């Protein structure tokens, strides 16, 4: 009855991005991947080789190996009562870098710079970012902002 082939229930995910069909950028082939980088997996329907399984679409992981036209990715797959470690081998068309890695990196850079400046200045390094604090007091004026008395409206059809 049920069929569970390698490309089952993927009518839509390997589709291509309306009015961006066809060939691919070469920025993807020009991108450089080292070991330890963080990469988000997104498949491509044009390229049949190096294709990941449908489970790994949208996931992200670290890279552990590099080859002529592909990279070795690590992923942590949930199965049962444990997380197993899967090792993918993916061509570069099905992958991209992660931006949270770069923004965390430049945050660390800002932290090093601010710690240097705070060592030059003295006290109040203050690097830990806190959540949205509650607001504080203030005074609202009525100059040109006189309060208008609203009221709920009746019922009408205007169908």
């Amino acid at each position: 009855g049920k069929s569970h082939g390698y490309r089952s229930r993927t009518r839509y995910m390997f589709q291509r991005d309306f009015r961006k069909h066809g060939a691919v950028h070469l920025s993807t082939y020009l991108k450089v991947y080292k070991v330890g980088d963080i990469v988000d997996i997104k498949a491509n329907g044009s390229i049949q080789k190096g294709m990941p399984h449908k489970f790994y679409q949208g996931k992200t992981g670290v890279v552990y190996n590099v080859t002529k036209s592909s990279v070795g990715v690590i992923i942590n797959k949930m199965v049962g009562n444990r997380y197993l470690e899967k090792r993918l081998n993916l061509r570069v068309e099905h992958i991209k870098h992660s931006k949270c890695r770069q923004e965390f990196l430049e945050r660390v850079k800002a932290n090093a710079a601010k710690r240097a400046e705070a060592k030059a200045q003295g006290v109040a390094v203050q690097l830990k970012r806190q959540p949205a604090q509650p607001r504080e007091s203030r005074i609202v004026s009525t100059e040109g902002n006189v309060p208008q008395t609203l009221a709920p409206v009746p019922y009408e059809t205007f169908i």
Partner: protein, 222 residues
């Protein structure tokens, strides 16, 4: 020979000056609180005089109490209750309000009653139901020696300094509140009003944010 009189007298001379500095700290805290309320009163009056509207600053502190029992709680609210330390009906804690907590509060809303407490309730509640968590062992406070011992490394020497750190939500609030055991409150003495409890406060129920009417509920049930 006996070699006890000098040590005893030295002990008394030391704890005497501890008592002194505690006294002169509490006095300053009292002046601080009364000045703080008087100034916002005069501010709300001065804005009316000017033909304006002085808004009040948002509250920093939320006392929250559990309302629903133990049975038939979904997992994510159950975990949030465990994280706020509400393992039991009619248990209560304090909370430093922020974006990270208000989401938990709207998530846990149909199982708690939370609100903005007052200095009077904090005092009247800590003095009666004051227990501390140290090797855990849930010790009653009953003395400032415990607090000197287990929070001297944050300047907290006394129970008054503790309630100060709680009200003026200070840097050491996490440590102080986690040192506090969760408060094991009773049921309300004059009832809840409201014969059906598990509706929102606004629809004629109990749960959710009663903003300042929490100080009545806790003073009843404590």
């Amino acid at each position: 020979a006996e070699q006890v009189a000098a040590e005893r007298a030295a002990r008394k001379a030391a704890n005497k000056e501890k008592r002194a500095i505690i006294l002169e700290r509490n006095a300053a805290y009292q002046k601080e609180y009364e000045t703080a309320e008087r100034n916002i009163i005069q501010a709300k009056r001065d804005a009316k005089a000017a033909g304006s509207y002085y808004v009040e600053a948002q509250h920093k502190l939320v006392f929250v109490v559990r309302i629903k029992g133990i049975n038939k709680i979904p997992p994510k609210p159950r975990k949030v209750l465990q994280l706020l330390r509400l393992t039991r009906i009619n248990s209560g804690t304090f909370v430093k309000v922020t974006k990270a907590t208000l989401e938990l509060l709207k998530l846990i809303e149909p199982y708690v009653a939370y609100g903005y407490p007052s200095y009077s309730t904090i005092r009247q509640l800590v003095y009666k139901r004051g227990f501390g968590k140290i090797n855990k062992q849930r010790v009653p406070l009953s003395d400032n020696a415990i607090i000197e011992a287990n929070l001297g490394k944050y300047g907290i020497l006394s129970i008054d300094d503790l309630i100060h750190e709680i009200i003026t939500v200070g840097p050491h609030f996490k440590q102080a509140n986690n040192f506090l055991w969760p408060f094991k409150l009773s049921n309300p003495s004059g009832g809840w009003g409201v014969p059906r409890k598990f509706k929102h406060f606004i629809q004629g129920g109990s749960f959710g944010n009663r903003e300042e009417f929490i100080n009545k509920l806790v003073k009843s049930m404590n």
